[PDB]
């Protein structure tokens, strides 16, 4: 239910359960339709969001119109915190990939919570560190891996985040377009298409809409690195 999903967000881990239930209760429930923009990169804001259902992509923009997708968040994930702790523009656009349900609060509310519960501040440090940890790997990936290996990685990352076991395989209803997968990878639409085709062609994965079955993890794993 909504309170169990919210209770799993990093920001509440090990924190007093009671304080958690009460804090959840002062959060606002919102719902966005698919494709809605929650905020744009460069906007100022200090609202924070914790998703309870659906997927939100976080997009950054190059002067020439193009975009890379930093990541795709889903239920229990948090975004919006960064502008609070380092005041400044949104470091990306948050856009609903599906219909999205989230809990949200302003930064006054968050600050008061932290003042009542220092453990929150500690969990927030773990959250930003873990994000530096992941993003550093993405950067390494751009420096050291070829496009096909990067595509492979991206897919295994989607599988770990959103994958279901389905008749021996990983069902990954990622809901992304072809171009968006590419933006997630940080490479051209053609190369990324090429690699994807290759991987289907070998039987490693199976395309089927904005969804992928991943049937030999290890082969795809071998190909990344």
Ligand X SMILES: Nc1ncnc2c1ncn2[C@@H]1O[C@@H]2COP(=O)(O)O[C@H]2[C@H]1O
Detail the residues annotated as belonging to a binding site for 3',5'-cyclic AMP. 65-71, 80-83, 90-91, 135-136, 143-144, 179-189
Strands 205-207 and 93-96: unpaired
| Mask for 25-54, x = binds a second copy (CB under 8 A) | ------------------------------
Q: Is the dihedral of CA 19, 24, 80, 123 positive or negative?
A: positive
- 186-205 mask for a second copy (x: CB under 8 A)? x-------------------
Q: Is residue 154 packed enough to be buried (19+ CB in 10 Å), middle (13-18) or exposed (0-12)?
A: buried
Residue 75 binds to ligand X (criterion: CB under 6 A):
no
SS3 90: coil
* Per CB under 8 A, 114 contacts a second copy: yes
Determine the Cα–Cα distance for residues 83 and 80; give it in Å rounded to an integer.
Answer: 7
Least separation in angstroms between residue 181's CB and a second copy is 15
Phi, psi of 209 (to 5 degrees): 85, -150
Distances (CA, A) of 16 to 3, 52, 76, 212: 14, 21, 18, 39
Question: Closest approach of Cβ 35 to a second copy, in Å?
Answer: 23
* Stretch binding ligand X (CB under 6 A), from 83-91, 100-108, 118-126, 154-162: 83-91
Q: What one-character-per-residue DSSP string does 156-194 give?
A: HHHHHHH-EEETTEEEE-----HHHHHHHHTS-HHHHHH
The per-type count for the chain, helices as H runs and strands as E runs, is: 9, 12
Smaller CB separation from ligand X, 45 or 149: 45
Nearer to a second copy, 32 or 79 (CB): 79
The item of a second copy, ligand X, none sharing an interface with residue 71, based on CB under 5 to 8 Å by kind, is ligand X
Return residues touching a second copy (CB under 8 A): 60, 62-64, 66, 68, 70, 81-82, 84-86, 88, 91-92, 111, 114-115, 118, 121-122, 124-126, 128-133, 135-136, 138-140, 142-144, 186, 225
Return residues touching ligand X (CB under 6 A): 45, 58, 70-71, 79-83, 90-92, 131-132, 135-136
């Amino acid at each position: 239910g909504v309170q169990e999903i919210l209770s799993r967000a990093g920001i509440f881990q090990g924190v007093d359960p009671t304080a958690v239930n009460n804090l959840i209760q002062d959060m606002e429930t919102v719902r966005f339709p698919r494709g809605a923009t929650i905020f744009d990169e460069g906007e100022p804001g200090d609202r924070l969001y914790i998703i309870t259902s659906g997927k939100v992509k976080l997009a950054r923009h190059a002067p020439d119109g193009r975009e890379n997708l930093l990541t795709i968040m889903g239920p229990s994930d948090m975004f919006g915190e960064l502008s609070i702790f380092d005041p400044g523009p949104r470091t990306s656009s948050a856009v609903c990939v599906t219909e999205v349900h989230a809990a949200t609060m302003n930064s006054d509310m968050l600050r008061n919570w932290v003042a009542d519960h220092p453990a929150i501040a500690e969990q927030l440090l773990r959250v930003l560190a873990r994000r530096l940890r992941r993003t550093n790997a993405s950067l390494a990936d751009l420096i050291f891996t070829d496009v096909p290996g990067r595509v492979a990685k991206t897919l295994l990352q989607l599988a770990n985040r959103f994958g279901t076991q389905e008749a021996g395989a990983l069902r990954v209803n990622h809901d992304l377009t072809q171009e968006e997968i590419a933006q997630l990878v940080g490479a051209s639409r053609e190369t990324v298409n090429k690699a994807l085709a290759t991987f289907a062609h070998r039987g490693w994965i199976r395309l089927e809409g904005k969804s992928v079955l991943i049937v030999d993890t290890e082969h795809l794993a071998r190909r990344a690195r």
